[PDB]
């Protein structure tokens, strides 16, 4: 599929989805309208671990890059692995003005060796 990736703009209301690839559509089911404006934390559901969700709260918040791989949820409820990959991006003023959170599906690392 093409790149899945979401960019955020932090300088709304809970860093709300701006802009979504097509390959993100593809991979989760949803259309774009369903997508633009919402917080990326829509995939998680109910096997989404809680502890990977707070390094993803502390990565934010402290404005670093992370990647975690995390359960997450298509549109008809089909899960999948996520390896998401989170960067802040700063202009050249120093700012934040963007995160970008790239999208691979699998389960690259076996779950017992997360845990
Ligand atoms: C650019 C960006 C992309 C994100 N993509 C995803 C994603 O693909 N799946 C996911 O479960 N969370 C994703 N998140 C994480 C959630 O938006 C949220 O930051 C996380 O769940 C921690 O905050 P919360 O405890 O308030 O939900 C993304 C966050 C950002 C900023
Ligand atoms: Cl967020
Ligand atoms: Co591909
Ligand atoms: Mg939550």
């Given at each position: 599929m093409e790149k899945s990736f979401v960019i955020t703009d932090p300088r709304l209301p809970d860093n709300p989805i701006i802009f979504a690839s097509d390959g993100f559509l593809e991979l989760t089911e949803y259309s774009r309208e369903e997508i633009?404006?919402?917080?990326?934390?829509?995939?998680?559901?109910?096997?989404?671990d809680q502890a990977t969700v707070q390094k993803i709260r502390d990565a934010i918040r402290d404005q670093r890059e992370i990647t975690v791989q995390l359960i997450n949820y298509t549109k008809s409820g089909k899960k999948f692995w996520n390896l998401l990959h989170l960067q802040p991006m700063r202009d050249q003023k120093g700012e934040l003005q963007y995160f970008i959170g790239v999208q691979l599906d699998g389960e690259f690392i076996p779950n017992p060796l997360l845990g």
């Open positions: 633009l404006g919402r917080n990326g934390r829509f995939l998680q559901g109910p096997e989404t």
